[PDB]
C-alpha cells in the first residue's frame, strides 16, 4: 500500500530512512506522502508529533509507526535494529492496530474571527499574554472555580507522561478515554481558591475557560504555540477522532513507563 | 418494598430516622434490615460507608441513599430538609439508579490461612507493621518498581476525593471504571527509585504488591484496618461489582466537588 | 523629618494620602520625595514594591511603612483606620526599626554589555525566551545539576509567601538571612535529573545559572521583567543591603501568615 | 586522647574497626567507650545516629567521624579506603571542627509523669495512636492552625535530606540555625484548613502541638519511636546544644547532596 517516512533530519535518521525505502522496494509498496496508509516516523517523539499533525486530516486511514534513533520514546518505541523486521511485516499487510484518544480544543473570538478548532496528541496549555493569568473554569455549564496563576494544562491519556507529569498530574493508561487538567503555580489564599488536585474528565464532558479581564492568551497545542487575541472562550473535550498505531509486538504502556522513568 | 435506615447515633440523626420511618408507614413500605431493597444512611460519609459494608453481599439488589445531618458529604449528599420529599418518591418506586465502581483487594498468605478478599468503596492502603515498608510493585505480571516509603494507597474513582486527594492524587469522575495508586512519602535517591506520579489503571489490570523482607503489613479497607501476618501478595483490581445509588435529582459530581472544596 | 507618600491611584488611597499629609502639617514634618527618611505606601503589596524600587539607592536612610486599603498585605499590613495614630508616632520620632534581607541578582553578558545588578525584595525568576529552558546550576563553583523545565525562582525570606509559595517552596521567617531556590515544572526521567526539593542557601553562598544552548532568558525581578540577550551567567546571592521598616506595634510574621492564608 | 569506635556489626565494618584500632595503637591513643573525645562510626548513617544518641550527654567534649562501608551517607561521608589516612591526622590532634544544630523536643503529661526532653539529630515526628490525628499548632503562644491528617515532622537542617525531603520539605544548609516543620497527608476542604507549605523557624521560636480529642500520640525521635499516653503538649525548638564533627578535608554539603541524589 501507499506509505511515507519522515526523518528527524540528522545523519543517523536520514540513512535509516533510505535503507527502509530500499527495503520497501523489494515489496509491493508505493511511496506516497500525499495519501499514505502507513506513516513511519524516524527520530524522537517530536518527530512523531510532527508526522501526526502533518496528516491529522486522514487519521482514520493511517496507521502510524515510530522509530527512535536516540533514547526510547513513548510514540517512537522501536529501535533502529528492528527496522528490517519492521519492513517485512509492514509490507506483508495483516497487522493489528491500536488506537489512542485525542484532545479537541476550540477557541472562540469576537466579531472578525472564525471559531478555530485544534487536535492535540499530547496536551494543550493556556498562559497569559504578559500580565496576570485569570480565568473562570466552567465544567458542563457549571462554574467550578476562578483560576489565578501561571496557566492550565489539559492532557490526553498518552500525553500524561509529558508536560502533565511535570505538573504533578497522574499517568493514566491510554485505553481510558479521558482528559486530565492540571494547574501551573496557582495562587491560593483566603480570598483566592482553586481545587489544586488534577482533574480527570470522561468523554462528553466539556471544560470551558472564560476570561475575566485580559482576553489575550498564549495557547499551545503540542509543539505549536500561538498568541490569540480577543478570546471569548476556550473549550476542551475528548475528541471523537483517534490516532491509530500499527502493532507488531507487545510493548505494554506500563513497561514503556518503567523503561523511561525507572531504568532500562 | 423492603427498606431500612441506619443512623449516626446522635440526637439529630435518630429523630430524623424515626420521622422517615413514620412517613414510610403512610405507604406500602416494609421495614427490613435483613433483605432490604433500599438502604438509607443518615449522618455522614462514615455512616454511609458502614451501611455499604453491612450489606456488601447484596449490592446488586440494593439502592443506597445518603442524608447528611452535618456538612455535605460525597455519598450523603441530601439535606435533612429534603427527607419528606425523599420518602414520597422512594415509596412511589419508579426512580433511576446510578452505579459507581468498586475496588477488589486480595490478600494471599502462606500455609495455614485462606486467601481473603475485600471490597472497598473509597480506598485500600498498605503500611508496614513497624519497621520499614518495602514492596515490589508488579503490574500485569511485569515488575514495575521497588517501593520504599510509608505506604501505598489504591483508590476507587469516588474515593479520589478522600485519602487519595491528600496524597496528591487526581480527582476522577466516578463514571470512569478505574483505580488510582498513590505513594506515601516515598524515599528517592540515586539507589532507590519510584515513579512518584499517581497511576490510573483501567479494568482488568492487576496491580500486585510483593514483600521484600518483612511479610507483615497493616492493610486498611475504608475504615477497617487489620494487621496481616505472613503475607505473600497483595492484589488490586477494579471490581466486577458496583454500588447502586437511587437518583432523585441532578447533583453533579463536579458540583459536589465544588461545594466541598471551593465554597457552598 | 523628610517624608513622602505613594498612592495606588484609586479614590480610596488618594484621599487617605491627602488626609495623612494634612495631619503631618500639624507636626514638624517636611514633604520630600527626593531625599525622604520615611516612605509611606498606601494600597497593596504591589504599591509597596514600587515604593521600594523607587528608593532602592537610599535604603540605608529610609524606614518604610505600608498601609493596605484592600486586603491585608505582608508589607502593607496596617489598616486605613490606624492612619491618624500612625501620623502621631511617625512625627514623634523615636521608633524601633525592623530589617529584612534582600536578594542580589547579577547578569553577565558578552562583549558589548556591562554587567547589570538588580535588587529584589520578593524574588527573581528565569525563563526561556521561547524555546526550551536548559541551564547548568553551579553552587559555589561546583556543578550541581543541569536543569530542564519551565524555569527557576530564587526568593527572599519575606518573598517566600509570594511566588515561592505557589511553587512548593517553604515559608521562612524573615529574620533568617537566606535565599530559597525553587523549580518550575522540571522534567525528570532516566536521562535528565534535578533535585526537585527547594534549596535554602545562607549568606555568602553563590548560586550561578549558566546557559547550555540558548543564551536568551526572560529574567524577572519582582514586578519588572526584561528579555536579556547574549547572557553568559546569572548570579544569585543574599544581598549585603537590607530594607528597614518602621515598627510601631507587634504584628508577628506568623500571625501575618495565618491571617492571609488560614483566616482573619 | 580517648577514643572509641562503633561498628554496624557486619563482617566488613568489624574488620575495618579492628584495623583502625590496631593503627591507633601505633600512636598515643587510648581506647575508652565511657569518656571518649573522638567517636568514630563505621557503617551507615543509622550507625552514626546510634553513636550520636549513645553519647548525647557529652556532645560538647566529642568530635564525631563517620565512615560509610556501603553507599555514601550524609554523616558517614568517608570511604573505607581513607581509614589509614584518617588515623594519622586523628592521632596527630590539631584538626578543625564543624558544628550542626540539633532539635529539642519536650513532651508534657498530666499528673503522674515528669516532663520528658529529647534531642534529635535528624527529625521528630508525631502520629496518632490509632484513630484520627488532630492537633492545634501554636507558634510562640499564638494559635496558627488546627492540623488534621497523618502527622507532622519537625526536622533539623542536616535532617532535611532524610524524612523531611520525602514530605516535600526544603533542603537547607546545616550552617543555618533553624528547624523545619512539614505536613503528612493533611486533609483540606472548606471546613478544615492548613498552611500546606513547609515552615522554617529560627532560633528561640517555640512551636507547640496541643491535643484536641485524643491525648495519645506515637512520637518518634530519629530511629526511636514510643507511644506516649496522656499528653498535654509537644514542644519543639532549636536546641542550644550542637553536634561537633572532626573536619579533615573539604566535603561541601551541596556536593554531598549532589552525590547522593543526582549522581556520583
Ligand atoms: N527528553 N525529552 N523530550 C521532552 C518530552 C517529549 N515528549 C513528547 Br514530544 N511526547 C512525550 C510523551 N508522550 N511522553 C514523554 N515525553 C514526551
Ligand atoms: N471531614 N471529614 N471526614 C474525613 C473524610 C471522610 N470521607 C469519606 Br468516609 N468518604 C469521603 C469521600 N468520598 N470524599 C471525601 N471525604 C470522605
Ligand atoms: N492576591 N494578590 N497579589 C499577588 C501577590 C502579591 N504579593 C506581593 Br507584590 N508580595 C507578596 C508577598 N510578600 N506575599 C504574598 N503575596 C505578595
Ligand atoms: N537509603 N537509606 N536510608 C534511609 C535514610 C537514612 N538517613 C539517615 Br539515618 N540520616 C539521613 C540523612 N541525614 N539524609 C538522608 N538519609 C538519611
Coordinates of C-alpha atoms in Angstrom, one line a residue, chain D residues 104-111 113-118 124 126 133-142 205-212 214-217 219 228-237:
Chain D
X104 CA 15.0 19.9 71.2
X105 CA 11.7 18.1 71.8
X106 CA 9.7 18.5 75.1
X107 CA 6.7 16.3 76.0
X108 CA 4.4 17.3 78.9
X109 CA 1.9 15.0 80.5
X110 CA -0.7 15.2 83.3
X111 CA -0.3 14.2 86.9
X113 CA 4.6 11.7 84.6
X114 CA 7.6 14.0 84.6
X115 CA 8.3 16.3 81.6
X116 CA 10.5 14.4 79.1
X117 CA 13.0 16.1 76.8
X118 CA 14.7 14.5 73.8
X124 CA 11.0 14.3 65.3
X126 CA 4.1 12.8 65.7
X133 CA -4.6 12.7 64.3
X134 CA -5.9 16.2 65.2
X135 CA -3.7 18.8 66.9
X136 CA -3.7 22.6 67.3
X137 CA -0.4 24.2 66.2
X138 CA 0.6 27.1 68.4
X139 CA 3.6 29.3 67.3
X140 CA 5.1 31.5 70.0
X141 CA 1.9 31.3 72.1
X142 CA -0.2 32.2 69.0
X205 CA 10.9 30.3 68.2
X206 CA 8.7 27.7 70.0
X207 CA 6.3 25.5 68.1
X208 CA 3.7 23.7 70.3
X209 CA 1.4 20.9 69.5
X210 CA -1.7 20.6 71.7
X211 CA -4.3 17.8 71.5
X212 CA -8.0 18.3 70.6
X214 CA -7.2 12.0 71.7
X215 CA -4.2 12.6 74.0
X216 CA -2.2 9.6 72.9
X217 CA 0.4 10.1 70.2
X219 CA 6.2 10.2 68.9
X228 CA 3.1 8.4 74.8
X229 CA 0.0 8.5 77.0
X230 CA -1.9 11.4 78.5
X231 CA 0.0 14.0 76.6
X232 CA -0.8 17.7 77.3
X233 CA 1.7 19.4 74.9
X234 CA 4.5 18.7 72.5
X235 CA 7.1 21.5 72.3
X236 CA 9.7 22.0 69.5
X237 CA 12.6 24.4 69.4

